[PDB]
Scaffold this motif. Structure first.
Motif, PDB file in Angstrom:
ATOM      1  N   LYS A 127       0.656  -1.131   0.106  1.00  0.00           N
ATOM      2  CA  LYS A 127       0.069   0.042  -0.037  1.00  0.00           C
ATOM      3  C   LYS A 127       0.956   1.212   0.028  1.00  0.00           C
ATOM      4  CE  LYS A 127      -3.703  -2.334   2.338  1.00  0.00           C
ATOM      5  NZ  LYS A 127      -4.243  -2.772   0.982  1.00  0.00           N
ATOM      6  N   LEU A 128       2.211   1.264   0.643  1.00  0.00           N
ATOM      7  CA  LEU A 128       2.980   2.258   0.720  1.00  0.00           C
ATOM      8  C   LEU A 128       3.558   2.710  -0.548  1.00  0.00           C
ATOM      9  CD1 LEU A 128       4.962   1.256   4.052  1.00  0.00           C
ATOM     10  CD2 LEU A 128       2.818   2.688   3.719  1.00  0.00           C
ATOM     11  N   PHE A 129       3.516   1.725  -1.476  1.00  0.00           N
ATOM     12  CA  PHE A 129       4.426   1.948  -2.715  1.00  0.00           C
ATOM     13  C   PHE A 129       3.166   1.745  -4.115  1.00  0.00           C
ATOM     14  CE2 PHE A 129       8.687   2.461  -1.231  1.00  0.00           C
ATOM     15  CZ  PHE A 129       8.533   1.626  -0.283  1.00  0.00           C
ATOM     16  N   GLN A 130       1.933   1.977  -3.765  1.00  0.00           N
ATOM     17  CA  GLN A 130       1.137   1.875  -4.989  1.00  0.00           C
ATOM     18  C   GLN A 130       1.009   2.994  -5.845  1.00  0.00           C
ATOM     19  OE1 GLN A 130      -2.252   2.675  -6.485  1.00  0.00           O
ATOM     20  NE2 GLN A 130      -2.148   4.453  -5.713  1.00  0.00           N
ATOM     21  N   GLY A 131       1.288   2.732  -7.277  1.00  0.00           N
ATOM     22  CA  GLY A 131       1.504   3.750  -8.252  1.00  0.00           C
ATOM     23  C   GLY A 131       3.003   3.665  -8.545  1.00  0.00           C
ATOM     24  N   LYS A 132       3.737   2.961  -7.797  1.00  0.00           N
ATOM     25  CA  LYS A 132       5.361   3.115  -7.846  1.00  0.00           C
ATOM     26  C   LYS A 132       5.994   1.768  -8.265  1.00  0.00           C
ATOM     27  CE  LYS A 132       5.529   7.229  -5.022  1.00  0.00           C
ATOM     28  NZ  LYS A 132       6.673   7.842  -4.245  1.00  0.00           N
ATOM     29  N   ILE A 133       5.345   0.597  -7.546  1.00  0.00           N
ATOM     30  CA  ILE A 133       5.906  -0.628  -7.423  1.00  0.00           C
ATOM     31  C   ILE A 133       4.979  -1.497  -7.414  1.00  0.00           C
ATOM     32  CG2 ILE A 133       7.335  -2.364  -6.446  1.00  0.00           C
ATOM     33  CD1 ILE A 133       8.927  -0.151  -5.320  1.00  0.00           C
ATOM     34  N   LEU A 134       5.119  -2.655  -8.164  1.00  0.00           N
ATOM     35  CA  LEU A 134       3.963  -3.657  -8.459  1.00  0.00           C
ATOM     36  C   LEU A 134       4.329  -4.811  -7.480  1.00  0.00           C
ATOM     37  CD1 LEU A 134       2.906  -3.761 -12.271  1.00  0.00           C
ATOM     38  CD2 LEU A 134       1.704  -3.045 -10.332  1.00  0.00           C
ATOM     39  N   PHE A 135       3.864  -5.150  -6.229  1.00  0.00           N
ATOM     40  CA  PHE A 135       4.149  -6.245  -5.370  1.00  0.00           C
ATOM     41  C   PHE A 135       3.653  -7.480  -5.851  1.00  0.00           C
ATOM     42  CE2 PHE A 135       5.469  -4.357  -1.133  1.00  0.00           C
ATOM     43  CZ  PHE A 135       5.967  -3.103  -1.695  1.00  0.00           C
ATOM     44  N   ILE A 136       4.470  -8.409  -6.051  1.00  0.00           N
ATOM     45  CA  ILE A 136       4.299  -9.841  -6.496  1.00  0.00           C
ATOM     46  C   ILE A 136       4.522 -11.097  -5.742  1.00  0.00           C
ATOM     47  CG2 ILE A 136       4.825 -11.334  -8.376  1.00  0.00           C
ATOM     48  CD1 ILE A 136       5.553  -8.721 -10.003  1.00  0.00           C
ATOM     49  N   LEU A 137       3.965 -11.970  -5.613  1.00  0.00           N
ATOM     50  CA  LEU A 137       4.299 -13.379  -4.861  1.00  0.00           C
ATOM     51  C   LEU A 137       4.847 -14.284  -5.609  1.00  0.00           C
ATOM     52  CD1 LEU A 137       4.724 -15.153  -2.153  1.00  0.00           C
ATOM     53  CD2 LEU A 137       2.331 -15.880  -3.012  1.00  0.00           C
ATOM     54  N   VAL A 138       5.912 -14.892  -5.470  1.00  0.00           N
ATOM     55  CA  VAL A 138       6.563 -16.136  -6.413  1.00  0.00           C
ATOM     56  C   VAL A 138       6.682 -17.378  -5.364  1.00  0.00           C
ATOM     57  CG1 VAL A 138       8.421 -17.268  -7.638  1.00  0.00           C
ATOM     58  CG2 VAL A 138       7.937 -14.588  -7.604  1.00  0.00           C
ATOM     59  N   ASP A 139       5.610 -18.195  -5.491  1.00  0.00           N
ATOM     60  CA  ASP A 139       5.564 -19.380  -4.546  1.00  0.00           C
ATOM     61  C   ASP A 139       6.669 -20.420  -5.085  1.00  0.00           C
ATOM     62  OD1 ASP A 139       5.169 -21.505  -2.951  1.00  0.00           O
ATOM     63  OD2 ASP A 139       3.367 -22.105  -4.184  1.00  0.00           O
ATOM     64  N   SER A 140       7.769 -20.403  -4.225  1.00  0.00           N
ATOM     65  CA  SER A 140       8.967 -21.235  -4.455  1.00  0.00           C
ATOM     66  C   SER A 140       8.737 -22.587  -4.211  1.00  0.00           C
ATOM     67  CB  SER A 140      10.269 -20.649  -3.488  1.00  0.00           C
ATOM     68  OG  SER A 140       9.843 -21.115  -2.069  1.00  0.00           O
ATOM     69  N   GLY A 141       7.546 -23.058  -3.561  1.00  0.00           N
ATOM     70  CA  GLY A 141       7.141 -24.349  -3.567  1.00  0.00           C
ATOM     71  C   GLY A 141       6.820 -24.964  -5.041  1.00  0.00           C
ATOM     72  N   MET A 142       6.879 -23.975  -6.009  1.00  0.00           N
ATOM     73  CA  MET A 142       6.630 -24.558  -7.251  1.00  0.00           C
ATOM     74  C   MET A 142       7.561 -24.541  -8.330  1.00  0.00           C
ATOM     75  SD  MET A 142       2.477 -24.098  -7.722  1.00  0.00           S
ATOM     76  CE  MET A 142       2.381 -25.653  -7.781  1.00  0.00           C
ATOM     77  N   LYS A 143       7.746 -25.796  -8.969  1.00  0.00           N
ATOM     78  CA  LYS A 143       8.706 -25.911 -10.052  1.00  0.00           C
ATOM     79  C   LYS A 143       9.008 -25.043 -11.119  1.00  0.00           C
ATOM     80  CE  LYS A 143       9.337 -30.768  -9.639  1.00  0.00           C
ATOM     81  NZ  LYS A 143       8.211 -31.228 -10.615  1.00  0.00           N
ATOM     82  N   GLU A 144       8.017 -24.642 -11.639  1.00  0.00           N
ATOM     83  CA  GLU A 144       7.834 -23.626 -12.573  1.00  0.00           C
ATOM     84  C   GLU A 144       8.348 -22.381 -12.280  1.00  0.00           C
ATOM     85  OE1 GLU A 144       5.558 -25.716 -11.152  1.00  0.00           O
ATOM     86  OE2 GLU A 144       3.715 -24.554 -11.324  1.00  0.00           O
ATOM     87  N   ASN A 145       8.740 -22.017 -11.099  1.00  0.00           N
ATOM     88  CA  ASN A 145       9.466 -20.825 -10.562  1.00  0.00           C
ATOM     89  C   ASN A 145      10.829 -20.986 -10.139  1.00  0.00           C
ATOM     90  OD1 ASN A 145       7.161 -18.811 -10.749  1.00  0.00           O
ATOM     91  ND2 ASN A 145       6.298 -19.735  -8.782  1.00  0.00           N
ATOM     92  N   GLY A 146      11.331 -22.143 -10.311  1.00  0.00           N
ATOM     93  CA  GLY A 146      12.752 -22.515 -10.237  1.00  0.00           C
ATOM     94  C   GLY A 146      13.686 -21.475 -11.024  1.00  0.00           C
ATOM     95  N   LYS A 147      13.233 -21.324 -12.321  1.00  0.00           N
ATOM     96  CA  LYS A 147      14.165 -20.515 -13.104  1.00  0.00           C
ATOM     97  C   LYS A 147      14.061 -19.103 -12.931  1.00  0.00           C
ATOM     98  CE  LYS A 147      15.688 -21.786 -17.440  1.00  0.00           C
ATOM     99  NZ  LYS A 147      16.310 -20.427 -17.566  1.00  0.00           N
ATOM    100  N   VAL A 148      13.151 -18.579 -12.528  1.00  0.00           N
ATOM    101  CA  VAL A 148      12.819 -17.162 -11.998  1.00  0.00           C
ATOM    102  C   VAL A 148      13.491 -16.808 -10.660  1.00  0.00           C
ATOM    103  CG1 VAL A 148      10.479 -17.377 -10.952  1.00  0.00           C
ATOM    104  CG2 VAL A 148      11.386 -15.088 -11.338  1.00  0.00           C
ATOM    105  N   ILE A 149      13.684 -17.697  -9.877  1.00  0.00           N
ATOM    106  CA  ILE A 149      14.357 -17.897  -8.594  1.00  0.00           C
ATOM    107  C   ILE A 149      15.924 -17.587  -8.793  1.00  0.00           C
ATOM    108  CG2 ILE A 149      14.959 -18.648  -6.291  1.00  0.00           C
ATOM    109  CD1 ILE A 149      11.811 -19.689  -6.412  1.00  0.00           C
ATOM    110  N   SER A 150      16.530 -18.748  -9.697  1.00  0.00           N
ATOM    111  CA  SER A 150      17.812 -18.666 -10.054  1.00  0.00           C
ATOM    112  C   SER A 150      18.376 -17.701 -11.026  1.00  0.00           C
ATOM    113  CB  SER A 150      17.952 -20.107 -10.600  1.00  0.00           C
ATOM    114  OG  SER A 150      17.243 -20.352 -11.922  1.00  0.00           O
ATOM    115  N   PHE A 151      17.439 -17.078 -11.693  1.00  0.00           N
ATOM    116  CA  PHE A 151      17.957 -15.693 -12.148  1.00  0.00           C
ATOM    117  C   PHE A 151      18.651 -14.807 -11.249  1.00  0.00           C
ATOM    118  CE2 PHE A 151      17.737 -11.291 -13.574  1.00  0.00           C
ATOM    119  CZ  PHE A 151      18.233 -11.423 -14.848  1.00  0.00           C
ATOM    120  N   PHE A 152      18.026 -14.572 -10.068  1.00  0.00           N
ATOM    121  CA  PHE A 152      18.381 -13.574  -8.980  1.00  0.00           C
ATOM    122  C   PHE A 152      19.429 -14.403  -8.152  1.00  0.00           C
ATOM    123  CE2 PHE A 152      14.153 -12.258 -10.204  1.00  0.00           C
ATOM    124  CZ  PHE A 152      14.390 -11.109 -10.699  1.00  0.00           C
ATOM    125  N   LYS A 153      20.312 -15.306  -8.798  1.00  0.00           N
ATOM    126  CA  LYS A 153      21.308 -15.900  -7.792  1.00  0.00           C
ATOM    127  C   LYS A 153      20.784 -16.234  -6.181  1.00  0.00           C
ATOM    128  CE  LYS A 153      23.916 -15.325 -11.315  1.00  0.00           C
ATOM    129  NZ  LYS A 153      24.142 -16.698 -12.216  1.00  0.00           N
TER     130      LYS A 153
END
Length: 219
Positions: free
Chosen positions: A150-176
């Motif tokens: 709420k503090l950053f609305q209009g400025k930053i999109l807050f997103i949840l990445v469920d690391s419990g899901m295989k599909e998300n392994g690559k997005v997580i590994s991008f950020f080392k």
């Protein structure tokens, strides 16, 4: 269920503001397939408010010219139109996917559909909270993440990445980042290359806010 009839401007704004995501059909005549097609989405999207208006002043306030279905969302104050030939040849699957893609919330769950919506917002800064939905601390961390969003609305999109899901392994590994370093924050830009991370984060509002304010600095 059925879409809510919107007879004036104050009623329309109130309807749109009561909900994070609203879908409204603005029609100059009801004798088009868009109307029952719109009706059919209601049962399908329980997390969206469906409305409908033929009222002249309503259509004018929303800058509507001819039959248009709009998606409105709090998180970035967006108004997306399905217009002209999009609506002329509208079917349920196209309206369905349009709603899925563009249903961005104050905190949006990350998947290959929503990421399209997220990447096309006028907001170009994205924050990921990378943690496992099956964590003990998931609920509490998420509530605090919602507060900071709420503090950053209009400025930053807050997103949840469920690391419990295989599909998300690559997005997580991008950020080392590795499993053992979660929960973590990752912030990036849609049009630029810079990003940053906060591994083994404590997801407190203060910590999240500081991390965002640092990233925003200068840009």
């Amino acid at each position: 269920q059925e879409p809510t009839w919107l007879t004036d401007v104050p009623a329309a704004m109130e309807f749109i503001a009561a909900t994070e995501v609203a879908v409204i059909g603005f029609f100059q005549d009801l004798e088009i397939p868009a109307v029952p097609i719109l009706h059919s989405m209601v049962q399908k999207f329980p997390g969206v408010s469906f409305g409908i208006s033929t009222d002249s002043e309503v259509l004018t306030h929303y800058n509507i010219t001819g039959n248009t279905i709009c998606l409105f969302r709090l998180v970035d104050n967006e108004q997306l139109n399905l217009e002209d030939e999009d609506i002329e040849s509208i079917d349920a699957t196209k309206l369905s996917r349009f709603i899925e893609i563009n249903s961005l919330h104050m905190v949006t769950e990350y998947n290959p559909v929503t990421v399209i919506g997220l990447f096309n917002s006028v907001i170009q800064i994205h924050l990921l909270l990378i943690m496992n939905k099956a964590s003990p601390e998931y609920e509490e961390n998420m509530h605090r993440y919602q507060k900071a969003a709420k503090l950053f609305q209009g400025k930053i999109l807050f997103i949840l990445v469920d690391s419990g899901m295989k599909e998300n392994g690559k997005v997580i590994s991008f950020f080392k980042l590795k499993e053992s370093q979660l929960p973590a924050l990752a912030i990036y830009q849609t049009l630029d290359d810079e990003w940053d991370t906060l591994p083994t984060a404590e997801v407190s509002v203060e910590h999240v806010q500081n991390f965002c304010d640092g990233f925003l600095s200068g840009k």
